[PDB]
Symmetry: C2
Subunit: 93 residues, 2 copies
């Protein structure tokens, strides 16, 4: 009935699907971020699944510099992706 | 299938579903925000669909003070809802205290 509320639930559940695998269950480490990105957001990195790309992404996302991505930082990341899609919604910039 | 990519697509399209109804097609005015909230996010305001609630929400979301909610401000809003949902992922507050 409410696709946007369902979308939010997917955002929440997908985080935990990977954040709970290793160490802090509420934060994504490098390995968990790698798996989330490759499996759940393959269109984002595309062919850039190398270690250099993942280190750059980690540094971009880890705003509080604790070496992991928490839920707030993850939401900022997803917001950035949405904003990029927003820029091309009309079929031109 | 990639549910998270589908979720992002819905997040983007739902904005434009309402933002393009009046005036600036890339921003939600009060009227458009009301429609979006009531129809797409009824759980957020719940029973608080009065004018006082909607002015409060607009003030809370309109960070740049241009009287409307742009895409960036909308993302901040959805992020806050996601964080609130995150607190009850287990069906109780497992991150509290
Ligand atoms: Ca973890
Ligand atoms: Ca961090
Ligand atoms: Ca508008
Ligand atoms: Ca604004």
């Amino acid at each position: 009935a409410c696709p946007l509320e369902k979308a939010l639930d997917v955002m929440v559940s997908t985080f935990h699907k990977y954040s709970g695998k290793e160490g802090d269950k509420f934060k994504l480490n490098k390995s968990e971020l790698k798996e989330l990105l490759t499996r759940e957001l393959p269109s984002f990195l595309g062919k850039r699944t190398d270690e250099a790309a993942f280190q750059k992404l980690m540094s971009n996302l880890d705003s509080n510099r604790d070496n992991e991505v928490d839920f707030q930082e993850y939401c900022v990341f997803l917001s950035c992706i949405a904003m990029m899609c927003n820029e091309f919604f009309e079929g031109f910039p």
